[PDB]
């Protein structure tokens, strides 16, 4: 799943196997450089791709004046009463009406979903 570049010419490293050792290797095309593979997973394709939207949220959104603010959902970390909530509005979800809360307290960008 990870992406690596050869230390020689900083080009994309692609997977390759060695029959003699039967161990996964990452080899650079234009460089002939080789590296020992530690992940063992060439790639993972997520059809559902249920990526946690909380990671995608930016804590700075609390500074948006147009986002609604609720005092009924205190921050779980710092306990601040005021919080700003919004919807994902991210494509490829095929369904999105749940609210994502972000603590409005400065220096506490805590984010959660009820």
């Amino acid at each position: 799943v990870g992406i690596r570049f050869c230390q020689e010419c900083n080009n994309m490293l692609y997977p390759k196997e060695d029959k003699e050792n039967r161990i996964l290797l990452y080899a650079c095309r234009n460089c002939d450089y080789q590296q020992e593979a530690d992940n063992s997973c060439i790639y993972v394709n997520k059809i559902t791709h249920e990526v946690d939207e909380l990671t995608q949220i930016i804590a700075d959104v609390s500074q948006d004046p147009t986002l609604p603010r609720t005092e009924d959902h205190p921050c779980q970390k710092c306990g601040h009463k005021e919080a700003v909530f919004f919807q994902s509005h991210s494509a490829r979800a095929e369904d999105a009406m749940r609210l994502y809360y972000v603590c409005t307290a400065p220096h506490c960008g805590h984010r959660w979903t009820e």
Binding site: I58, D60, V61, Q63, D64
Partner: protein, 117 residues
């Protein structure tokens, strides 16, 4: 509605350089992720690590008409970590009353002064 006539972005660019904005030619690409891109008239000028302070400063300057003229647009896309500044002609704008702390900055003294226009 008013249509902006346009003005030079030079004063804004100079102020941004004076302010704590890192030039695009001097930074490393790794620093762009956390910082917010600064666009002036569609040209990516640099990045800033304190967008909230910069926007407050920019808004203060435009309201005081110090370095930023009235018809200059300052847009901060908080989600996209971008600050877009526009100075060119053809932008449609309208005058709006400023509100701070749920209070109009327009007070009775302004109305009284206008009454004797």
């Amino acid at each position: 509605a008013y249509i902006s006539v346009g003005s030079q972005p030079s004063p804004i660019l100079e102020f941004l350089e004076e302010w704590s904005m890192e030039n695009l030619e001097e930074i490393s690409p790794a620093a762009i992720a956390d910082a917010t891109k600064i666009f002036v008239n569609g040209c990516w000028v640099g990045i800033h690590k304190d967008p909230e302070q910069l926007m407050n400063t920019l808004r203060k300057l435009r309201r005081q008409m110090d370095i930023i003229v009235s018809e200059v647009s300052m847009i901060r896309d908080i989600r996209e970590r971008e600050i877009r500044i526009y100075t060119d002609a053809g932008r449609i704008c309208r005058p709006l009353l400023i509100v701070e702390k749920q209070k109009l900055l327009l007070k009775k003294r302004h109305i009284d002064q206008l009454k004797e226009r």
